[PDB]
RNA sequence: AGGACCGAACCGACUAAUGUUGAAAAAUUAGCGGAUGACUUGUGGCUGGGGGUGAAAGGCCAAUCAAACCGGGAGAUAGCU
RNA sequence: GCUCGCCGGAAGACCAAGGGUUCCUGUCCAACGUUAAUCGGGGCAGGGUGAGUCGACCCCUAAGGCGAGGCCGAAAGGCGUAGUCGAUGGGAAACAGGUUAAUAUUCCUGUACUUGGUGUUACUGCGAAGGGGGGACGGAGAAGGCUAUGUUGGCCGGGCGACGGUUGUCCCGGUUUAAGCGUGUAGGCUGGUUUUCCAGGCAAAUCCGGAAAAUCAAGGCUGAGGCGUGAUGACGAGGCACUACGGUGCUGAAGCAACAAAUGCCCUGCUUCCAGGAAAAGCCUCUAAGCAUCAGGUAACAUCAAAUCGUACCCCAAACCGACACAGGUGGUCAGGUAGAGAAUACCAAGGCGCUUGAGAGAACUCGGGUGAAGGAACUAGGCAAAAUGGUGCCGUAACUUCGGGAGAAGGCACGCUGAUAUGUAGGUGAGGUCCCUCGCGGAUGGAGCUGAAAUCAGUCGAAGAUACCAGCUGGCUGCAACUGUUUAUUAAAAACACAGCACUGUGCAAACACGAAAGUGGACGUAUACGGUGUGACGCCUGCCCGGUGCCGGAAGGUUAAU
């Protein structure tokens, strides 16, 4: 059993996107911004517990941070992690 | 023409990297000089 | 059989092959093989210690019985094989108990002959018995220097050692160089000359045949600069100096033996 | 069969012209040599400076070599400008 | 958007290395861009990289590195045992179609596969850090069998022609389909099987190896491709409709045969040669201690798991190495048509470009080319450079020679197209059909159909038929070096180095020698038919005299002579 505190610190935010809206309406897949050290089992357990909903599969990818220039000083945004969580058919989420 | 720098990260880190410097006595003196001078990038190693 | 090649090309003009049709035309015996990694003439410091070595064909090592310890048990000779590691051909023998080994092939040895080590062995080419059991005046090879150490003398393709005397614990040998040396009379020796006597009758014909054997080219010393060699230098071809090594040691005639430990074992030097 | 022949890839660099504040701190164009061999190439490794390596030109060792580079002795010394 | 031109064994496509968001969309034009710029690899904002099967990680080791102890060394430290790292190599498994502005063998649809688990059920010798097998290995060459792929025909759909003709022996386009599973073929290798015994494999062994005897010649292993299924599917020319004119939705014909055919596959094969061609694990098996009815083993079934990291984009390039958006350099993979021996070369397809200043004019001069009267090296240091030769087949071909060569010597003839032989031949392929069978992916016979050189004869056209690109100038005397090779990266490619060969000399093995204060290591897991050094430098005929000087070797009677 994965602890509930970790399950509360795994998920960061939902990711709004044209691709996220397409996968949500077609494949019934939500797109989440997750913690960087979070694994697929921790994500599947978190969505299955905190939302009480049935997860079919989780695909993950790491998003590399961009290099920006505030004024003339260079800088780099953070690497973050993105999860495609495919819900089972019939399941629904706000 | 073929110029003298043909990069390879593996050979770069095996030759000039952190653990290659920390392996020997004189390489540890290299890292002590760069810390005293205050280098931002202390070695090659990314 | 030496075969002069027909001159269809320079590099085949002067080639003499040594063709032996009795050698096995197949793979060697796999358990007796091991890896023989090349050196390039470079020691553990990586520097070149011995020059002119490098390249050549990959060579697997053949484990050869020089100690020859299977006493009493007779062995039949299974087949003759090529060894790239040495000038002499090797013989794959099969003991009665089921062990196979490689020995140096003697002159007249062929497939199907019986060999036997030990003291009570007969005296035919192939047997190995101590030289207090060997008659004076016979030609042996694969001769031990110390008892049980393994054979070290007369291992190259056509060599042999004569036994000229025996005084108790020692026998006096006539080595292939002409040196008369005392060896203990308990050291094993193998009867007969070593096989491939016409090995020296080959002619390589071209430079690549030496590069196949891992012999890099030798730059003669006077073709250098004086920083490189003592012979180097000159405006034209000049050699007004005595021939030395690259390290300044006289070569034409100067002796270099400085071992006072083994001087009691040397009866007469070579002439 | 061949350190065989002709000839592309590939490796090299014999001749001429251009260019010489170049397209290029050595190249282009037209020809040229080898092209199954002592061939060539990728990756990784080893050899360290009076030392390496060198089919040997004092050649090469990061566009630097009759003794690399960097830091230090060091503000060497300079009857010389 | 219509035309034109260029590449097309690349100037197309896919990657590794390397770079690191350069990817896509919106917006901006100050700077950057060798001009303008509304554009951009530029600025700004947002979005984008989805894996049990790809790769890494991981199991394994090579060269080599590190190295407990250890040995050695003023110190630092050097070497190295047990070990542990280390790919560029070995090791389980996924294919097709569809889709996004940007990802896909990653998502979706469909169909598979592998390795681990737990759990039952049947069965019952399990067990290794050990033994054995396997993994597991070279070069060259020859065919044969295939496929990728292409061409033609058939088939289906459409068309009937801006200018003479074109319902036909006419034109255009399409004719696609995988992994897996089953079959086990061409072909390659191999004698099987049973029992007994055994100084071997560090002990053991039922395993391997070796001895016997008996029986059976016929069992086994490997194996491309094909065929069947996958697939009543998907894809599919086109249509039918809406249409933000971008698109979105619906529907969907035929989907066959022959020939040619790879540098790819069978092939880690076969033949042959000498220069004699990695290791370890996974995998299979044998037993050791141990366990004794428990553990574990395999067999089926169920269930669970297969994590983590990379995945955008360039990759020959404007994104890599060159200071540049630099005519340079950069490893691997794919390899269409016509002609052609060909991956050369010419023109094209797919696809991608027109090289980030243009517009005129049409001086000298320079650059790169084209042609040239008569002469033809008189130019010049020198035929430098240009020009010329150039292909296939046949005839023919000198001195000399190491008998191989020289030699493609030199020199010369033919070459297009049409018709006939023969409405397309010889040859290749090989169907129907028939027959046989120990029956199939079978064996004969059979010749349909397809493909298809070359030659002779006759005719005909042009100035010219190897018509373009492509593509040897030849010969004579002579010096040097035998040759192939190598060399001054960046003014010297040579007669210089090397070379095979020859000779001298050292070296008896703890070898000489060399690198190392040393331990040690190379020589060499070699042993005088070996190794090192030196000189000469294929081959042929040869290599003469001098030991006084300088070296080296040998001598040990005398003289001299160190520390002590
Ligand atoms: Mg991933
Ligand atoms: Mg040598
Ligand atoms: Mg020599
Ligand atoms: Mg030489
Ligand atoms: Mg010189
Ligand atoms: Mg000197
Ligand atoms: Mg002179
Ligand atoms: Mg003189
Ligand atoms: Mg050749
Ligand atoms: Mg050129
Ligand atoms: Mg050629
Ligand atoms: Mg000089
Ligand atoms: Mg340099
Ligand atoms: Mg120096
Ligand atoms: Mg100096
Ligand atoms: Mg001073
Ligand atoms: Mg000064
Ligand atoms: Mg346009
Ligand atoms: Mg074109
Ligand atoms: Mg081309
Ligand atoms: Mg940017
Ligand atoms: Mg863009
Ligand atoms: Mg403006
Ligand atoms: Mg501008
Ligand atoms: Mg931009
Ligand atoms: Mg692994
Ligand atoms: Mg390992
Ligand atoms: Mg190791
Ligand atoms: Mg220690
Ligand atoms: Mg060590
Ligand atoms: Mg690898
Ligand atoms: Mg893309
Ligand atoms: Mg084993
Ligand atoms: Mg091979
Ligand atoms: Mg086909
Ligand atoms: Mg018309
Ligand atoms: Mg008309
Ligand atoms: Mg058609
Ligand atoms: Mg199938
Ligand atoms: Mg991609
Ligand atoms: Mg490109
Ligand atoms: Mg440009
Ligand atoms: Mg460029
Ligand atoms: Mg082509
Ligand atoms: Mg003009
Ligand atoms: Mg002209
Ligand atoms: Mg004209
Ligand atoms: Mg003229
Ligand atoms: Mg005219
Ligand atoms: Mg004229
Ligand atoms: Mg003249
Ligand atoms: Mg004149
Ligand atoms: Mg000329
Ligand atoms: Mg010309
Ligand atoms: Mg002369
Ligand atoms: Mg020459
Ligand atoms: Mg040459
Ligand atoms: Mg060169
Ligand atoms: Mg030069
Ligand atoms: Mg030159
Ligand atoms: Mg040694
Ligand atoms: Mg000479
Ligand atoms: Mg003489
Ligand atoms: Mg003398
Ligand atoms: Mg003397
Ligand atoms: Mg004296």
Author numbering:
A (entry chain S): 1 to 94
B (entry chain c): 1 to 46
C (entry chain C): 2 to 272
Sentences reproduced from the published study:
As a model protein, we have chosen the cold shock protein A (CspA) from Escherichia coli, which is a major regulator of the transcriptional response during cold adaptation in many bacteria. It consists of 70 amino acids (aa) that form five β‐strands connected by loops. Strands 1–3 form an antiparallel β‐sheet that is closed into a barrel by packing strands 4 and 5 to strands 1 and 3, respectively. Here, we combine biophysical methods with cryo‐EM structure determination to show that folding of a β‐barrel protein begins with formation of a dynamic α‐helix inside the ribosome.
The cryo‐EM analysis shows the CspA70 nascent chain attached to tRNALeu at the PTC as it traverses the tunnel and emerges at the exit port. We obtained two structures of CspA70 that differ in the conformation of the nascent chain. In the more stable conformation (CspA70‐1) the whole nascent chain backbone is traceable. The C‐terminal part of the nascent chain forms a short compact module within the contact range with PTC nucleotides G2061, A2062, G2505, U2585‐U2586 and, to a lesser extent, U2609. Below the L4‐L22 constriction site, the nascent chain forms a long helical rod of approximately 25 residues that extends toward the central part of the tunnel. Residues A751 and A1614 of 23S rRNA contact the nascent chain in the upper part of the helical module, whereas several residues of the extended loop of L22 (Arg95, Arg92, Arg84, Lys83, Gly91, Ala93, and Ile85) pack against one face of the helix. In the lower part of the tunnel, the L23 β‐hairpin loop residues Arg69 and Gln72, and nucleotide A1321of 23S rRNA also interact with the nascent chain. At the opposite face, nucleotides A507–A508 establish interactions with the distal part of the helical density. The spatial constraints imposed by the tunnel walls disfavor β‐structure formation; density that can accommodate a structured β‐hairpin is observed only upon reaching the vestibule, as more space for chain rearrangements becomes available. The structure is partially stabilized by the interactions with 23S rRNA nucleotides A63, G93‐U92, and C1335‐A1336, as well as by weak contacts with the protruding loops of L24 and L29 at the exit port.
